[PDB]
Symmetry: D2
């Protein structure tokens, strides 16, 4: 069974820590991004998400509320466990920036990927 | 100030309720999608997210754990208010399907938009 | 049969012309965006794409080489025709900005939607 | 200067071949995908795109008209050259499937990434 609780790094060097997953699949955690628009401002930020519970290789999603920006990121993906028991989170994300009014809405959403593996 | 708490509909005819937003910007709710891969199977599904608390037109994200599928959707966007006080959530989403192993990961993520308005 | 050749406008107020589609489904045209990072700089920009030729409601893609920026957009979508013969292009796009090196790549891709209808 | 003409592989094992880039930045080529919904049907497929010409690390886009499917993919990205002259294409893509009518449009667009390096 592919589990999400614990510490993970991604391909950009970011670190996240996920706490206990409850019986609904809900989890909280923290996210330390390696990169930002203004990296001098980066602070540890909270995340909240839900995974599927029954599945051995669950899909999941989470939201990161950046504590140093008006932006928000959401990640979704799947936890895969390979034949040797190694886990990988394959994810894609949307990063929503804050714009001044709806005329700027079109430029406010970035997309990308991240692959996560366990810290230890 | 653009508020997320309440009842919303989107351009596909889906509806959602969002409950009270706490001091950290966290919220729960319930999502009824109008569409699915198998629409005959649709059940009400929980959502969990975070918005920015201080901003007049906050960015936010939330995860929907579909209760009738192994998939998960994340939404992110911004709440805008026009001159007459009418709110719109401008959002982008990623829908993650469950695939068998990492070699199928490439086809597992759909993307789209949704615009939400308040019901009454 | 839903045809791409002609003059189109989208929900942001941008317009494009698409020229004749050849036997391979290839087409050129000209795009006038209503919006940019720097709207004072906007110039007409060429597009180049391919549609499926046989399909009544073809999928397609095209690239816009912005003539006033180092960025590029790609659009993909499908041409639908309703019962009265009215066409709509339902599209999704990626806007790639130029960044200095690979360490900035994560923030270089925006995503969004556009719905196009025929001008007259 | 980061050039696109030549043969490339990506992280999924796909191969593409780009021909001469003209003075406008337009190029054609072929794409042999390693993966598909129905891999038994895969055939070499044409692509058409545009890159920026002046830039040492140009952004670009291209469309692949799959010759074995009603779907279309668009790719956009940037060509980076590192301190040793090694080139990488960092891309993201949208894959548009053909659906029967507009009520299914919401599920028709997949998103993902690909990193390309030169075959030789
Ligand atoms: O910089 C920020 C906030 C931090 C985002 C980090 C992103 S989350 C996706 C990716 N995966 C990671 O591990 N880290 C990165 N927000 C921001 C960025 C750009 C703009 N902008 O206007 O361009 C505005 C806000
Ligand atoms: O059908 C599902 C679950 C429901 C998704 C509803 C989407 S959320 C984005 C959009 N906005 C809405 O209000 N409703 C739609 N999942 C699913 C679909 C296809 C496949 N598949 O394998 O093809 C697997 C799971
Ligand atoms: O502004 C630009 C070039 C023009 C992009 C217009 C986009 S295409 C998707 C959407 N549909 C339309 O009809 N129009 C918009 N590029 C750009 C923007 C921002 C940055 N940046 O660094 O922030 C760099 C280049
Ligand atoms: O399978 C197809 C056509 C081939 C697409 C190959 C994709 S292009 C992005 C990625 N990078 C690669 O090098 N190769 C893959 N189309 C398709 C897929 C799924 C569905 N579907 O309905 O699920 C319909 C058509």
């Amino acid at each position: 069974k592919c589990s999400l609780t614990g510490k993970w790094t991604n391909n950009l060097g970011s670190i996240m820590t996920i706490r206990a997953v409850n019986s609904r699949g809900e989890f909280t955690g923290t996210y330390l991004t390696a990169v930002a628009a203004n990296p001098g401002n980066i602070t540890l930020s909270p995340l909240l998400g839900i995974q599927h519970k029954r599945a051995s290789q669950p899909t999941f999603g989470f939201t990161v509320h950046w504590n140093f920006s008006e932006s928000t990121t959401v990640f979704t993906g799947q936890c895969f466990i390979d034949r040797n028991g190694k886990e990988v989170l394959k994810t894609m994300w949307l990063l929503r920036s804050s714009v001044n009014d709806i005329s700027y809405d079109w430029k406010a959403t970035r997309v990308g990927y991240n692959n996560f593996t366990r810290l230890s």
